């Protein structure tokens, strides 16, 4: 009975007041659901709860079957559209993981497993960052910064997305135009444009306008423009229910759309924000991660997340990665 995606969104915004935010819920939630796989006691429960698991309607396994389905429904780089999701386990040379954990990871999550010498911190980082970089076509370069020495295993998740718009924007239709960060801080940005039929929507409650711009394939970009002075209001009103409401509320309309060509990114240490969603234990020495290993002790040192997006007249490019680091002491 909680909106993890939007609860996390607000947490990240509150922590960075008037700065850009960007992340991949699927990446983080899938990572969390994987983590719960080798979690026990209350720690295994804060995660499921934090995800908004029904414990009845949805039963743990349904959660995994879902992500499993998602991973399976993935298609090869079609034409002008590509979405890939992967999971990887990097295990120290001298540690054993429980058969169940490893098995579930390979079966439900199609996870790769790479032996890693964590005694050589520099080498471990290179191996892992190179993999994440490789999987995100060079969009996420340095996921880990100072890999602890007690690092004995790192669980990684990545997401890559590239797609051309269903209908591009006329490259020559872009002009330098004013952008108001605040009514007083204004900066020039290349403003894209295109008059056409779009799925419009006017939410008078949250107080904002929503446009749906489809991609060549299955993925639509939703751009929310909160009315003057209401960004905070709509941010608070964001919810899974709202998104559903917005989705069928959508009716096509003749629109002369002006969108700025942009690029943003976010880096977050999730171990710092998740306890705001009730996910705290697993990140402490009080953690119960007995499902992952028997030489217990281990906890989650940090959970780094990184996401980037590029938006131009051709389409969009987006990727992100989540690195769950398990240490010994």
């Amino acid at each position: 009975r909680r909106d993890f995606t939007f609860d996390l969104y607000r947490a990240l915004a509150s922590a960075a007041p008037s700065q850009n935010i960007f992340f991949s819920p699927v990446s983080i939630s899938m990572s969390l659901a994987m983590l719960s796989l080798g979690a026990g006691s209350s720690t295994k429960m804060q995660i499921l709860e934090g995800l908004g698991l029904n414990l009845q309607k949805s039963s743990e396994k349904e959660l995994h079957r879902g992500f499993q389905q998602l991973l399976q429904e993935l298609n090869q780089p079609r034409d002008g559209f590509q979405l890939s999701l992967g999971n990887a386990l990097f295990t120290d040379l001298v540690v054993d993981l429980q058969d169940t954990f490893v098995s579930a990871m390979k079966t439900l999550y199609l996870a790769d497993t790479f032996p890693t010498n964590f005694r050589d911190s520099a080498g471990a980082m290179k191996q892992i960052n190179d993999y994440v970089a490789k999987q995100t076509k060079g969009k996420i370069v340095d996921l880990l910064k100072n890999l602890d020495s007690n690092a004995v295993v790192i669980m990684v998740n990545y997401i890559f997305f590239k797609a051309k718009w269903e209908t591009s924007f006329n490259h020559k239709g872009t002009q330098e135009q004013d952008f108001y960060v605040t009514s007083e801080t204004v900066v020039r940005v290349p403003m894209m444009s295109r008059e056409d039929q779009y799925h419009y929507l006017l939410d008078r409650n949250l107080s904002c306008r929503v446009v749906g711009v489809p991609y060549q394939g299955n993925a639509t970009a939703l751009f929310i423009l909160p009315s003057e002075g209401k960004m905070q209001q709509v941010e608070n009103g964001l919810s899974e229910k709202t998104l559903r409401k917005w989705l069928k509320m959508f009716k096509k309309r003749q629109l002369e759309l002006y969108l700025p060509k942009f690029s943003i990114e976010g880096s977050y240490q999730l171990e710092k924000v998740l306890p705001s969603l009730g996910i705290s234990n697993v990140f402490t020495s009080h953690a119960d991660l007995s499902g992952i290993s028997n030489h217990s002790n281990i906890q989650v040192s940090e959970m780094v997340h990184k996401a980037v997006v590029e938006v131009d007249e051709s389409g969009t490019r987006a990727a992100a990665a989540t690195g769950t680091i398990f240490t010994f002491r």
């Binding site: 850009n20 759309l257 987006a318």
Partner: peptide
Amino acid sequence: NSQRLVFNRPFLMFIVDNNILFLGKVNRP
């Protein structure tokens, strides 16, 4: 008619599949 819609102030962004793939706020291009 032809309604005008210009994103010249902070704005949210969703990249939706059947699930929410990406979410963020563009506070400043």
